[PDB]
mmCIF file of C-alpha atoms in Angstrom:
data_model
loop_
_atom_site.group_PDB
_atom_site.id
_atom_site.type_symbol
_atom_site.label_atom_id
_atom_site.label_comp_id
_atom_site.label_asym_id
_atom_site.label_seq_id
_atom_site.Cartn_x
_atom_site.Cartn_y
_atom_site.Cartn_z
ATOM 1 C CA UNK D 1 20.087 -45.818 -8.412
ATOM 2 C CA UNK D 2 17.422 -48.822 -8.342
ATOM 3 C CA UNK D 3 20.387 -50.752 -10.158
ATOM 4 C CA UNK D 4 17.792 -51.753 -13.268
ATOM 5 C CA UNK D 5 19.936 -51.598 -16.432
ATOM 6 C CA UNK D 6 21.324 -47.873 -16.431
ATOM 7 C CA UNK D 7 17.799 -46.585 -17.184
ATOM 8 C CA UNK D 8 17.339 -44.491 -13.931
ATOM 9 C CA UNK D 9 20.877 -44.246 -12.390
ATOM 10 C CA UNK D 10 19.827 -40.605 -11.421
ATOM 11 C CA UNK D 11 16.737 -41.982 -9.556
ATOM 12 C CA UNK D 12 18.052 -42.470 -5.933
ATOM 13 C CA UNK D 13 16.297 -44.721 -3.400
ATOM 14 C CA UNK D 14 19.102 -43.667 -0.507
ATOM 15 C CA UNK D 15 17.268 -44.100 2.795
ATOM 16 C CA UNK D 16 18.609 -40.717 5.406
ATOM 17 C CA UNK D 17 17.285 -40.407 8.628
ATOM 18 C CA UNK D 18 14.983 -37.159 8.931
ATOM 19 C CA UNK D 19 12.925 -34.892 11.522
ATOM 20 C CA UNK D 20 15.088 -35.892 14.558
ATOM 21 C CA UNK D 21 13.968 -34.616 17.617
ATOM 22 C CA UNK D 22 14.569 -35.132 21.070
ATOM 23 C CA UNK D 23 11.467 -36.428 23.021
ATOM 24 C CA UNK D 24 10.720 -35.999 27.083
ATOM 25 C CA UNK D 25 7.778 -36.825 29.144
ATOM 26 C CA UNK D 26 6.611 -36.721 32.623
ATOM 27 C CA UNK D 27 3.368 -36.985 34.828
ATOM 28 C CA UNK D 28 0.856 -36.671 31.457
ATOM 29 C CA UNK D 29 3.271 -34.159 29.167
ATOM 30 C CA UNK D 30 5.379 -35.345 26.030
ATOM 31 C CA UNK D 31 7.582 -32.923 24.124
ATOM 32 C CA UNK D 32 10.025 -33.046 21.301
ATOM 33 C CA UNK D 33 12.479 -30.395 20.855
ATOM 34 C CA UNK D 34 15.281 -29.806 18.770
ATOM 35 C CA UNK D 35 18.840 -30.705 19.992
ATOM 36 C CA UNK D 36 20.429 -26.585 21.239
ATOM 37 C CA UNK D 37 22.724 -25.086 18.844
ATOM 38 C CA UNK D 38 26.304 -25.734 20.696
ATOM 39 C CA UNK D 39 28.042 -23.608 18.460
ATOM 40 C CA UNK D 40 29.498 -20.182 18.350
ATOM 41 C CA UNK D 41 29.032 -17.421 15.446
ATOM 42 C CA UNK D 42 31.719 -18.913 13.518
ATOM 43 C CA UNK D 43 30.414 -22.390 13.688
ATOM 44 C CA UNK D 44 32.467 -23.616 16.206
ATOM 45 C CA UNK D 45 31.071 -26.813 17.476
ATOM 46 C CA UNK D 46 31.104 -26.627 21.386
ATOM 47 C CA UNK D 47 31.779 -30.306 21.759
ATOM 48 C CA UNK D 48 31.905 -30.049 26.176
ATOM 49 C CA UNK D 49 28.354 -28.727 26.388
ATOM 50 C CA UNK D 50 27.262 -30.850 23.402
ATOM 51 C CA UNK D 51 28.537 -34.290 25.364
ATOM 52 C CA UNK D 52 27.386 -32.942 28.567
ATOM 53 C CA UNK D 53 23.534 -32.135 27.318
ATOM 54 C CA UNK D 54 24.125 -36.167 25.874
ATOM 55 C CA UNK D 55 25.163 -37.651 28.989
ATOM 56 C CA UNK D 56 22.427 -35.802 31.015
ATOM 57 C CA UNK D 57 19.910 -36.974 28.601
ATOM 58 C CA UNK D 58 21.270 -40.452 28.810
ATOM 59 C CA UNK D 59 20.869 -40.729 32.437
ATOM 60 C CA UNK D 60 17.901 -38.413 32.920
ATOM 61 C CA UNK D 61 14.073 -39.933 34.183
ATOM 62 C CA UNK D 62 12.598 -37.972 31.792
ATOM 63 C CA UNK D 63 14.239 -38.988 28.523
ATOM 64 C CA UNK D 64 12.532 -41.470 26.040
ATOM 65 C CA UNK D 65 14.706 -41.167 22.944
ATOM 66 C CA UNK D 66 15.028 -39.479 19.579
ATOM 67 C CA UNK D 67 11.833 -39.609 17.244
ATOM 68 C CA UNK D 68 13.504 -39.996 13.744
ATOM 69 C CA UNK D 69 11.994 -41.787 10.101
ATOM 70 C CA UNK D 70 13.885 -42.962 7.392
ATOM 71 C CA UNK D 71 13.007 -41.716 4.224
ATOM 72 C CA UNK D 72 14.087 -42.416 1.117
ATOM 73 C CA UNK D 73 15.277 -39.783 -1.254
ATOM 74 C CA UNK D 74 12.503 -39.985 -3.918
ATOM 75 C CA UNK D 75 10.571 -39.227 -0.977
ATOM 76 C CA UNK D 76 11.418 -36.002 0.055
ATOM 77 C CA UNK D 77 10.388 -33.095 -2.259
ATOM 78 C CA UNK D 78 11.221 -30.658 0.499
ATOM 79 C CA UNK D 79 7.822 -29.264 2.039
ATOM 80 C CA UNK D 80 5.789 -32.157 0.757
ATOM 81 C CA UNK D 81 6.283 -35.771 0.971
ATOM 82 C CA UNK D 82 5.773 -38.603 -1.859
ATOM 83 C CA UNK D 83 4.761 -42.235 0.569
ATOM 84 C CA UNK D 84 1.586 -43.225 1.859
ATOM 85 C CA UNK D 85 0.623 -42.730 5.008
ATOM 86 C CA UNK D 86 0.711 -46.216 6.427
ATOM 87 C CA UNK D 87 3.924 -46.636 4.775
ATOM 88 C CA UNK D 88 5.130 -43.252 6.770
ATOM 89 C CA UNK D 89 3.802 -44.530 10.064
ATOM 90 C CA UNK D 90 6.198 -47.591 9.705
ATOM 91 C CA UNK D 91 9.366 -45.706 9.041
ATOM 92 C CA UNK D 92 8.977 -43.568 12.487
ATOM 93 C CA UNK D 93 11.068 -44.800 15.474
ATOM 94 C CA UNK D 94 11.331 -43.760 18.785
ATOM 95 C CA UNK D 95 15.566 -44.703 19.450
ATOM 96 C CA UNK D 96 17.439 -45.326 22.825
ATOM 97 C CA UNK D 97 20.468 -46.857 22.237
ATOM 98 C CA UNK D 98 22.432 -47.679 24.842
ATOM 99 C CA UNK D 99 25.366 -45.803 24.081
ATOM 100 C CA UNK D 100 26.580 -42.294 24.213
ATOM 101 C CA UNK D 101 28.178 -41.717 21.290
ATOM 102 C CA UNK D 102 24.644 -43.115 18.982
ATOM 103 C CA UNK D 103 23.002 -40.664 21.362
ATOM 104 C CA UNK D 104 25.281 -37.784 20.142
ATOM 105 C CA UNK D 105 25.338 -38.688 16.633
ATOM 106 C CA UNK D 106 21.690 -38.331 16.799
ATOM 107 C CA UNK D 107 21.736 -35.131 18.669
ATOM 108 C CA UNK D 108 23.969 -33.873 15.870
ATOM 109 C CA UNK D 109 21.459 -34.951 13.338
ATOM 110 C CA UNK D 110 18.849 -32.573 15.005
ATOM 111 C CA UNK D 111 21.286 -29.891 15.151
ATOM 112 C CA UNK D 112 22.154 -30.106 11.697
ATOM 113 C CA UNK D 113 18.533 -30.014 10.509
ATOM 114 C CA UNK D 114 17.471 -27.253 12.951
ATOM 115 C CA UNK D 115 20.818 -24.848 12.036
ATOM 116 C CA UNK D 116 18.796 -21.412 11.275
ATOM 117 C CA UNK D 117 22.006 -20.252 9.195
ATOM 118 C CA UNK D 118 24.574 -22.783 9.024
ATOM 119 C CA UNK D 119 27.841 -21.940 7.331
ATOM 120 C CA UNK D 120 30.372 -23.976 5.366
ATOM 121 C CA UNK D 121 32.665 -24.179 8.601
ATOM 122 C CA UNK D 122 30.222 -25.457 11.389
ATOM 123 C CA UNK D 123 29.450 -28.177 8.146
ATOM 124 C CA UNK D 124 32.517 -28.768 8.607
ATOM 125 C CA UNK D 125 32.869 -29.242 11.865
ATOM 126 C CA UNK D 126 30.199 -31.171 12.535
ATOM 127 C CA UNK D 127 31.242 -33.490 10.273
ATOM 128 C CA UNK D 128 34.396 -33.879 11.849
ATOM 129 C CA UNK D 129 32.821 -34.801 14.919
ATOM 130 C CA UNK D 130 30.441 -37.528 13.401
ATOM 131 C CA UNK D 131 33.814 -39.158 11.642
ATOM 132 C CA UNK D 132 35.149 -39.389 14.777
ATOM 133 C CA UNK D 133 32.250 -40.507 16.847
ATOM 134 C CA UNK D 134 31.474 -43.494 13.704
ATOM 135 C CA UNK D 135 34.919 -44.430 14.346
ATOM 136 C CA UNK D 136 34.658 -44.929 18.033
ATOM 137 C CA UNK D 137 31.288 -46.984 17.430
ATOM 138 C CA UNK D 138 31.972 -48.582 14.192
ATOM 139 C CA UNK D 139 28.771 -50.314 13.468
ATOM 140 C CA UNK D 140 25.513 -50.569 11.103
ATOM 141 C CA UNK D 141 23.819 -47.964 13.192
ATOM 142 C CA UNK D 142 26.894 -45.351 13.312
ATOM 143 C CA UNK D 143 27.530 -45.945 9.557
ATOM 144 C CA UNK D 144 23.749 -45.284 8.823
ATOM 145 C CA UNK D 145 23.689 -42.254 10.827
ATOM 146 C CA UNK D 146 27.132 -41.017 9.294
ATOM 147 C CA UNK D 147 25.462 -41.506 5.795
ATOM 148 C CA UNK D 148 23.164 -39.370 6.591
ATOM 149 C CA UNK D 149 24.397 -36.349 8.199
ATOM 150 C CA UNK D 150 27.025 -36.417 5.372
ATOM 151 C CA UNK D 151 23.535 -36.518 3.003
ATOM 152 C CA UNK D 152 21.766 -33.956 5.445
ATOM 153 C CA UNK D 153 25.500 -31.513 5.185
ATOM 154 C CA UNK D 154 25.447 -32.450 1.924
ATOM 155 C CA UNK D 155 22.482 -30.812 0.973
ATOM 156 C CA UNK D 156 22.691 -27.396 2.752
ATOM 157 C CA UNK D 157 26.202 -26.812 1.404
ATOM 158 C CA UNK D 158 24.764 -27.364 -2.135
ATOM 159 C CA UNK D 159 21.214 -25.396 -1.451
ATOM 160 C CA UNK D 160 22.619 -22.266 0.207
ATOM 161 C CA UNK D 161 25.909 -22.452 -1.716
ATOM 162 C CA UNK D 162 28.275 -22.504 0.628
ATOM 163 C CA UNK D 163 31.248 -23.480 -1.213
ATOM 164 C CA UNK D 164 33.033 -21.041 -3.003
ATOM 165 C CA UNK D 165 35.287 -32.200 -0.706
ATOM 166 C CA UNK D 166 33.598 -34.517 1.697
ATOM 167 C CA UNK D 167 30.592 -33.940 0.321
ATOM 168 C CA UNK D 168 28.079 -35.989 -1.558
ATOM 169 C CA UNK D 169 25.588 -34.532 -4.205
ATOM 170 C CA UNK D 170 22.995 -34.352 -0.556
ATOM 171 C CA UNK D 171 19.391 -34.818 -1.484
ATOM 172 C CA UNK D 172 18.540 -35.499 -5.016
ATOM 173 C CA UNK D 173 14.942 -33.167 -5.021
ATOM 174 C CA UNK D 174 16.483 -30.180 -2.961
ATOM 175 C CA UNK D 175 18.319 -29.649 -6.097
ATOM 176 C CA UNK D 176 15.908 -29.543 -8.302
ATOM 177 C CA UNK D 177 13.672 -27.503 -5.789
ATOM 178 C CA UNK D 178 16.462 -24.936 -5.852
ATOM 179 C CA UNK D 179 16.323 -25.264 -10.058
ATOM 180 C CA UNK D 180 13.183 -24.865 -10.649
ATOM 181 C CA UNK D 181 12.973 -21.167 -9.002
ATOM 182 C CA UNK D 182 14.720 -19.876 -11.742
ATOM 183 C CA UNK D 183 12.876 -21.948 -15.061
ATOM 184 C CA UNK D 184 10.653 -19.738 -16.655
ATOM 185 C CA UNK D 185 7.100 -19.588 -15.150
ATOM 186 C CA UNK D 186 5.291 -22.373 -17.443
ATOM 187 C CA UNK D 187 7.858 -24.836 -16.814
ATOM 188 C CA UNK D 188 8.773 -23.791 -13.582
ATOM 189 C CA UNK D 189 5.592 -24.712 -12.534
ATOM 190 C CA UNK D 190 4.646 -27.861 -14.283
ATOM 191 C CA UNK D 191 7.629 -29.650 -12.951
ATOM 192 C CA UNK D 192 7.106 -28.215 -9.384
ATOM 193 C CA UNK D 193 3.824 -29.825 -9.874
ATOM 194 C CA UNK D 194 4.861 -33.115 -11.237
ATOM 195 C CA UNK D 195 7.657 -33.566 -8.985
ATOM 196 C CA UNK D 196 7.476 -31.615 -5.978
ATOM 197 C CA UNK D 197 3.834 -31.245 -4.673
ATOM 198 C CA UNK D 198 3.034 -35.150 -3.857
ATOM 199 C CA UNK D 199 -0.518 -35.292 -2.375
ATOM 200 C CA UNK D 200 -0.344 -38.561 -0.996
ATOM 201 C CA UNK D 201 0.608 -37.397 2.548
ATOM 202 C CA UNK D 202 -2.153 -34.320 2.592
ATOM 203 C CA UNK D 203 -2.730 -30.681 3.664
ATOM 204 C CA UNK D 204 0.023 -28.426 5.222
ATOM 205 C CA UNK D 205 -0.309 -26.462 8.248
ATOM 206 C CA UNK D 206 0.425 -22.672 8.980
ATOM 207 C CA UNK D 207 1.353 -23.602 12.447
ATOM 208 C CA UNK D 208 2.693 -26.810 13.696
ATOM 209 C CA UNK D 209 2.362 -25.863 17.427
ATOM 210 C CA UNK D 210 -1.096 -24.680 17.400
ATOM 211 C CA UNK D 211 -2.235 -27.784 14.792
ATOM 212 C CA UNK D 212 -0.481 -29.764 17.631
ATOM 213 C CA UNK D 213 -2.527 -27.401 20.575
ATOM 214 C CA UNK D 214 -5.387 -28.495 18.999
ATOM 215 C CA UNK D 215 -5.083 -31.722 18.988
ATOM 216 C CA UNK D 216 -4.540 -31.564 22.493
ATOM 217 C CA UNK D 217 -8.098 -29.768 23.246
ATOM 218 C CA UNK D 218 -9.900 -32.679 21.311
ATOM 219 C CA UNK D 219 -9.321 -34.622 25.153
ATOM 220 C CA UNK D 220 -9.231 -32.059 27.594
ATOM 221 C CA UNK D 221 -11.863 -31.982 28.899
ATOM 222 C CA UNK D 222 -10.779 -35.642 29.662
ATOM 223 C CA UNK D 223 -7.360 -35.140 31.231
ATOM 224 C CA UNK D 224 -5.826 -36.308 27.684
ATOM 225 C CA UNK D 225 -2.203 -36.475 27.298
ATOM 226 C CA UNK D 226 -0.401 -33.456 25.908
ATOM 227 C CA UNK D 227 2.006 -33.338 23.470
ATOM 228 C CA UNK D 228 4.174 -30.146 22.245
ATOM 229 C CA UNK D 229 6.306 -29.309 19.227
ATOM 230 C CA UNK D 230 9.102 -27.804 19.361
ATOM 231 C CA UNK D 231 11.588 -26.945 16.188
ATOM 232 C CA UNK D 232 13.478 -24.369 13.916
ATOM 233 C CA UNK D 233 11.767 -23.803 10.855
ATOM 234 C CA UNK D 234 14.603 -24.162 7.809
ATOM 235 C CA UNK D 235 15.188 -25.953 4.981
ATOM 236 C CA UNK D 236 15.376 -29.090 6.558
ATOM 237 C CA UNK D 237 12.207 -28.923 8.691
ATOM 238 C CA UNK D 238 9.600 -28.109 6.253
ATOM 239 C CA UNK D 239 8.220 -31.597 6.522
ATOM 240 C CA UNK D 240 6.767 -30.562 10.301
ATOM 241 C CA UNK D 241 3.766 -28.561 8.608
ATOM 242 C CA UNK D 242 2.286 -31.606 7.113
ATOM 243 C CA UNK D 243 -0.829 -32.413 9.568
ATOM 244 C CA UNK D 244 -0.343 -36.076 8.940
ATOM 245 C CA UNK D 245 3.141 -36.091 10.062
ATOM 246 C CA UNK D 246 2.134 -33.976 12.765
ATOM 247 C CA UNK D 247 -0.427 -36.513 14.456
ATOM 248 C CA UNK D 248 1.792 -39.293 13.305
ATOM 249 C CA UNK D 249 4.393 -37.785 15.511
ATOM 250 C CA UNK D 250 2.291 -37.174 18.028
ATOM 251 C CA UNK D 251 0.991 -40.870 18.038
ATOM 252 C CA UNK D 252 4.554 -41.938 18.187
ATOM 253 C CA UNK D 253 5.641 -39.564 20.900
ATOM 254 C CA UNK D 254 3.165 -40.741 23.058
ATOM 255 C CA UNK D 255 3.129 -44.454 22.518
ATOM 256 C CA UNK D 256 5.318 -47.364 23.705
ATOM 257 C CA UNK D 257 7.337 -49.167 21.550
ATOM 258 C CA UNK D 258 11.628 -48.107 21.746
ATOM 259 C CA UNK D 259 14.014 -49.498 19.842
ATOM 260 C CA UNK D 260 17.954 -49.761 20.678
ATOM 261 C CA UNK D 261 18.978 -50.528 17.237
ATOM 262 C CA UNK D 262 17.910 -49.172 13.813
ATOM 263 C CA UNK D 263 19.584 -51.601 11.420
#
């Protein structure tokens, strides 16, 4: 909670990093993509190929970091977000740390928000993996990024109910999202109004990739840059059809300014 008396110890101002993405460019191209899914049908985590996509991207000319913004969880109301836009702009990063195992926390990150179906063992799993990769790197970073894929887990166990633990209570509006469904209708959608449809970041978007094509044409005739989208709609990535995000990201993507270290 905000820590002011007891009054709103349910009201949580947790920041979790959210809408990781890889992001590549060369000659006058910029993509993000999500991190593969380097698991099997069980949920297996398939940690070789996961390191070895990490150390190619670590190493490779086209690689410029993972786009990632920390939100807070009073924020996030699933498929709509509650922060101003300039506010929004400021919490974007483009990342590069210098350092593998950041690089494959991150990676993990995108996988977990990306996972189409994920089940309680590759939550699991993954977990594991970030425990042990925190404990190799044992920093602010590491413990910010193990916060919140334990958050990020967190939340899809609870949502899709996949415990019949490690785990915290995850997102504090996915729950109520996942509450509301079943209130009867007045209610149900007075309090979806109240305190899941923010306006403040705007209009939502059928289709990310061609709201993102067309903001390509606006300069083609110029030679404009181009910038794609590339992600797994789920639970997670809802926040990708908001058209400010979108050019946000885009602006982002394209410009200059890395970082090596979040905190």
């Amino acid at each position: 909670g905000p820590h002011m008396g007891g009054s709103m110890q349910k009201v949580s101002l947790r920041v979790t990093p959210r809408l990781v993405l890889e992001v590549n460019r060369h000659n006058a191209i910029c993509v993000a993509t999500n991190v593969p899914e380097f698991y099997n049908a069980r949920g297996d985590l398939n940690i070789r190929d996961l390191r070895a996509h990490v150390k190619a991207r670590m190493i490779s000319s086209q690689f410029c970091g993972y786009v990632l913004v920390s939100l807070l969880d009073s924020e996030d109301q699933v498929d709509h977000l509650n922060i101003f836009p300039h506010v929004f702009s400021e919490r974007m990063i483009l990342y590069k740390p210098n350092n593998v195992n950041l690089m494959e926390m991150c990676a993990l990150l995108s996988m977990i928000e990306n996972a189409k179906s994920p089940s309680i063992g590759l939550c699991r799993e993954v977990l594991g993996r970030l425990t042990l990769l925190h404990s190799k790197c044992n920093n602010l970073d590491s413990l910010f990024l193990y916060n919140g894929a334990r958050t990020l887990l967190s939340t899809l166990v609870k949502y899709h109910d996949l415990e019949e633990g490690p785990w915290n209570e995850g997102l504090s509006l996915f729950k109520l999202h996942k509450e509301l469904k079943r209130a009867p209708s007045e209610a149900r959608d007075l309090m979806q109004s109240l305190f899941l449809t923010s306006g403040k970041m705007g209009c939502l978007a059928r289709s990310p990739k061609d709201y993102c094509a067309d903001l390509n044409k606006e300069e083609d005739a110029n030679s404009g840059f181009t910038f794609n989208l590339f992600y797994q709609d789920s639970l997670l990535t809802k926040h990708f059809q908001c058209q400010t995000v979108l050019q946000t990201l885009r602006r982002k993507c394209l410009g200059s300014d890395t970082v090596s270290k979040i905190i």
